[PDB]
Each structure stands twice: as structure tokens, then as C-alpha cells.
Design a protein around this ligand. Structure first.
Ligand code: 9GL
Ligand code: 9GF
Ligand code: OLC
Ligand code: OLA
Ligand code: OLA
Ligand code: OLA
Ligand code: OLA
Length: 473
């Protein structure tokens, strides 16, 4: 309590109405459509209860209540020259800082959703549910409320006798660095988060030409073995989760059988030196097993999925169907255990289900594979080709949404970036008359942001538009 509050009302009476009709219209064009964006969401049973678009409510609410507060209390201050209480101002201001912090945490939670929906394609539907998404936003909001009510708890320059900010009344210049700090680094990770998801997302069986018998007759000739039935395993060597130890226990016990001559096995991986010393012995002990644990070209392995006819995923549990999807897309019947996602991607009409970590029943399911016709075999390769299109499909609709989230994050950094940076110089230096009044006119960006956020839903979201013509035809 050294300087009074009126030294902050800088707008002369000609530029207090010009800033008013801006707040009242640009603040009406955001309340109208955000209150409308909330109407499409909660009617459409699709967008309402969905963890993918759940943020569009958490984004159109912080841009509505956080906007009506900033239109009332700002016009009631720079134009109506009102001096509230010392905790009534921080209450009215706390409702604004919480909202912006909340929409940052919305672009943060929506990034966890994006990473899971793309790089955990079938774990996603079972990790990110409606319960786990409702709890994550409510506690993301719980945090956004706390950071906003700190100066109401005693992190202010009045109740602490500290240098006040030249821009915000009743607020320390350290609470700024705690609020600009936690937000600039959050956007930094968030900006870095969506760029990792997009970069590693650009990382078709119509590229492989000819019949499969030809491409498999050319493959086994490279190894020097006869046209045989080619089983394939890909993945790290371990005994903990991948079933390479299970698979080697089956190839050995199948060797004591009459049906082993026709069976051709090919394994690639890298891991336990004793698991490698076990598999490489079979490669020279048998004339029909070849193990490749060195220099595997990523498009050569692409030729394997399309040349072979069976895929072996004997893992104890698949966290994400990385081979399961690429193999089936290239029409190679996968023989995996019904653990993890491999239950609803590999079924009794798409592949062969085995018991996890069971070496005997794995072999008994390799002999079953040897005794079936092309009628069945060509039909499984189709159902593997048909299941994959339902993935590179949704995983395409997912990738389009991680572009939408960046477009929202982009126009968030553009609107709130300059304001945030003008706050930064308040911490270090002082703010003269000019730099303090340009901030009040640049302050309108948090309303323009809430004006272009509902516009870009109606441009990117393919579902939200069709939901709009459904109740307003
Ligand atoms: C239902 C989630 C949701 C919101 C939303 O307001 N969550 C805020 C929930 C919440 C929880 C706790 C508090 N506390 C106040 C301070 C003291 C500690 C507890 C406050 C608020 N907004 C949404 C928009 C769309 C969708 Cl789909 C869901 C939501
Ligand atoms: C660490 C606090 C962050 C504040 C958010 C910045 C924001 C752009 C929302 C903002 C907030 C407040 C004002 C006005 C500053 C004037 O000095 C006093 C009146 C404020 C509006 C009343 C808020 O209840 C602002 O221009 C920008
Ligand atoms: C990190 C944990 C918190 C570190 C900040 C230390 C602190 O709370 O400072 C209080 C100060 O003494 C005002 O009373
Ligand atoms: C007519 C459109 C509604 C705009 C009115 C906003 C209220 C601001 C006021 O008059 O105090
Ligand atoms: C629709 C937008 C209407 C804007 C109303 C603003 C009232 C005013 O200009 O003071
Ligand atoms: C990030 C580090 C922690 C900041 C939260 C604790 C600060 C509250 C006490 C106020 C003060 O430091 O004077
Ligand atoms: C959208 C709002 C964009 C920013 C407008 C800022 C204009 C600069 C105001 C300067 C005030 C002055 O120098 O008198």
C-alpha cells in the first residue's frame, strides 16, 4: 500500500468507449458461439461422451466464463472507474487467470489422448475411457483454480509488503514468474509434445506386386530352402513379455514330428545372448530355420510380411499392435495369444489364437495351421487385410485431430503470446505510460482467441458440422 489503484486507469474517455464497443461485440461474438458450441456437444450423444472431443467442452467453457468475467470486470474498471475490495479484485481477476490456465491444461490432456490414440492404437480404447477422462479434466481444473486463488491466500504485494507489478494490482512480481513460468514451460512441452506425435506419425499392400506364391518362391530361394510354409516372428528376444522363448520351445518340439519337413521358420530379433545362442544353434542344426539378428532393412521386413503367410506373435501381452497391424495390412495371418489388444484384432475369423506363454499349445496350433486349404487360407488373409483398413482409417482420423489441436494451440500462442511477453518485461523493468496503455488494447486478444476457437471447430471437426445439421436442418 504505497501507490493507489487509479494510476492504472490509463484510457482517456475517447478510447474507453472504443475499447468498450470492442469488448461488448467481440465479447458477444464469443459468448454467442461458445454457448452454441456447448449446445451441439451435449446433445449429440457422440461428441458428448467421448474422450477424444471431450476437450471441446473444456475449451468452450473456459472461453465463455473466463470471457464474461473479463468483459464485465474490465469495462467496469477502465470505463466505470470502480475500485473493488483488495480480495474482491483478486477474486474477479482469479476467474480469468484460471480460465486461460485451464485451456492450456486442456491442450495438455488432449495431448495425452492424442499420443495414446495413435501410438497405442488398441490400448487406447481401453486406457482412455470416460471415467479416466472426467477425472483428469476435473483435477486439471482443480489445479487451474489453485494457481488463480494463490494471491487470495497471501501471495500478493499488499499482504506481503513486496514490490507490486506495474500492470496488475495486488499481485507480486514473483507470482508473475510463478504464473508465467509454469505456463511458458507448459506450452513448451505441449508444443514439443504435438510435434513428436506428428513427426513419428509419418513413420499399403498395393506396393507389392504379383502373386504371393511368386514373392514367397523368390524369398525362400534367397535362403536356399524349398517352397514351404513360411512362419515368421519379429521382435526383441526376451523371456519377460515377448514369446521368442515360447516360440523356440515349439520349433524344437515340432522337430520331433513328420510335419516338420514342410515347415519353414524364419525369426528376427535381438536380445538375450543366451536366447540368441539358442536360436542360432537351430539355424545350423536344422536346414529349414533361418534366424536374422543383424542389419534388417525396414522395407525388407516389409517384403517379409507380404511374402510369408503366417505371423507369430507369441508375446505374453501386446501393449500396442505394432506388428499385428502392419502384418495383417500386408495380408499375413497372425498367430498370437489373446492377451492385450490381440483379442479384438485377432479373432477366430482373422487368425489363430493360442495360450500365452504355452510352448506346447503353440506347437499344436502350428500343426493346425499346416492342415488347411487355400479356401480358408486366402479368406484369413482377407480378414487381415479388412481389419487393417479400420485402423490406418481411425488412425488417420486421429492424425487429423492432432492437427486440429495444433491449430488451436497455434492461435492460442498468437493471441496470448504478446500479452504474456508484455507481462515479462513488467517483472524485470518498469512500465512507462505508453507500454501500459498498449497492453489494455492488446488485452482484447483473449476475446479474439475465444472468437476464433469456435470458428476452427466448425472447420476441422468433421463430426461437429454433421451434428449441427442434425438438429438445425
Ligand atoms: C465435469 C468436468 C468439466 C468441467 C469443469 O468445469 N470441471 C471443473 C470441476 C471442478 C472440480 C473441482 C473444483 N474445485 C474448486 C476449487 C476447490 C477444489 C475443487 C472446481 C471445478 N468443464 C467441462 C467442460 C466439458 C466437459 Cl465434457 C467437462 C467439463
Ligand atoms: C498473473 C495474472 C495474469 C492476468 C491475465 C492477463 C489478462 C490478459 C487476462 C488480463 C487481466 C487483467 C487485465 C486488466 C489489467 C488492468 O491493469 C486492471 C484491470 C484488469 C481487468 C480486470 C480483471 O478482473 C488485463 O488488461 C489483462
Ligand atoms: C518449491 C516449494 C516452495 C518453495 C517456495 C518457498 C516459499 O514458500 O517461500 C515462502 C516465503 O517465505 C513467503 O512467506
Ligand atoms: C443487442 C446485443 C446485446 C449487446 C449488449 C451488451 C450489454 C452491454 C451493456 O449495454 O451494458
Ligand atoms: C452481435 C454483436 C452485438 C454487439 C452488441 C454491443 C453493444 C454495444 O455496441 O455497446
Ligand atoms: C515453483 C516453486 C514453488 C512456488 C510455490 C510456493 C510459493 C508460495 C509462497 C510465496 C512466496 O514465495 O513468497
Ligand atoms: C486485436 C488487438 C490488437 C492490438 C491493438 C493495440 C494497438 C496499440 C495501442 C496503443 C495505444 C497508444 O499508444 O495510445
Amino acid at each position: 500500500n504505497f501507490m493507489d489503484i487509479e494510476c492504472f486507469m490509463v484510457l482517456n474517455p475517447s478510447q474507453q468507449l472504443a475499447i468498450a464497443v470492442l469488448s461488448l461485440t467481440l465479447g458477444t461474438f464469443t459468448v454467442l458461439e461458445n454457448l452454441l458450441v456447448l449446445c451441439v456437444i451435449l446433445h449429440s450423444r457422440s461428441l458428448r461422451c467421448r474422450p477424444s472431443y471431450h476437450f471441446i467442452g473444456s475449451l468452450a467453457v473456459a472461453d465463455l466464463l473466463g470471457s464474461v468475467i473479463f468483459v464485465y470486470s474490465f469495462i467496469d474498471f477502465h470505463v466505470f472507474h470502480r475500485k473493488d475490495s483488495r480480495n474482491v479484485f483478486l477474486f474477479k481477476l482469479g476467474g480469468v487467470t484460471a480460465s486461460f490456465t485451464a485451456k492450456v491444461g486442456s491442450l495438455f490432456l488432449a495431448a495425452i489422448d492424442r499420443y495414446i490414440s495413435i501410438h497405442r492404437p488398441l490400448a487406447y480404447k481401453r486406457i482412455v475411457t470416460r471415467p479416466k477422462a472426467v477425472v483428469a479434466f476435473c483435477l486439471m481444473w482443480t489445479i487451474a483454480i489453485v494457481i488463480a486463488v494463490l494471491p487470495l491466500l497471501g501471495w500478493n504485494c499488499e499482504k506481503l509488503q513486496s514490490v507490486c507489478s506495474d500492470i496488475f494490482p495486488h499481485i507480486d512480481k514473483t507470482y508473475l514468474m510463478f504464473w508465467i513460468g509454469v505456463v511458458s514451460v507448459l506450452l513448451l512441452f505441449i508444443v514439443y509434445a504435438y510435434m513428436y506425435i506428428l513427426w513419428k506419425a509419418g513413420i499399403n499392400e498395393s506396393y507389392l506386386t504379383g502373386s504371393r506364391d511368386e514373392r514367397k518362391k523368390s524369398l525362400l530361394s534367397k535362403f536356399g530352402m524349398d517352397e514351404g510354409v513360411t512362419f515368421m516372428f519379429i521382435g526383441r528376444f526376451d523371456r519377460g513379455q515377448k514369446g521368442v522363448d515360447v516360440l523356440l520351445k515349439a520349433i524344437e518340439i515340432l522337430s520331433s514330428k513328420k510335419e516338420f519337413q514342410e515347415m519353414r521358420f524364419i525369426i528376427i530379433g535381438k536380445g538375450d545372448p543366451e536366447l540368441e545362442g539358442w536360436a542360432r544353434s537351430l539355424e545350423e542344426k536344422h536346414g529349414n530355420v533361418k534366424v536374422i539378428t543383424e542389419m534388417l532393412s525396414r522395407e525388407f521386413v516389409r517384403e517379409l510380411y507380404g511374402s510369408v503367410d503366417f505371423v507369430i506373435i507369441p508375446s505374453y501381452f501386446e501393449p500396442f499392435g505394432l506388428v499385428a497391424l502392419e502384418a495383417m495390412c500386408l495380408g499375413a495371418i497372425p498367430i498370437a495369444s489373446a492377451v492385450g489388444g490381440l483379442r479384438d484384432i485377432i479373432t477366430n475369423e482373422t487368425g489363430i489364437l493360442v495360450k500365452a506363454g504355452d510352448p506346447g499349445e503353440l506347437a499344436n496350433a502350428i500343426l493346425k495351421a499346416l492342415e488347411l486349404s487355400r479356401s480358408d487360407l486366402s479368406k484369413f488373409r482377407e480378414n487381415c487385410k479388412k481389419r487393417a483398413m479400420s485402423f490406418s482409417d481411425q488412425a488417420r482420423m486421429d492424425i487429423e485431430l492432432a492437427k486440429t489441436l495444433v491449430l488451436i494451440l497455434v492461435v492460442l500462442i498468437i493471441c496470448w503470446g504478446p500479452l504474456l511477453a508484455i507481462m515479462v518485461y513488467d517483472v524485470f523493468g518498469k512500465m512507462n505510460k505508453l507500454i501500459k496503455t498498449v497492453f489494455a488494447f492488446c488485452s482484447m486478444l483473449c476475446l479474439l482467441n475465444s472468437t476464433v476457437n469456435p470458428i476452427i471447430y466448425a472447420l476441422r471437426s468433421k463430426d461437429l458440422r454433421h451434428a449441427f445439421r442434425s438438429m438445425f436442418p
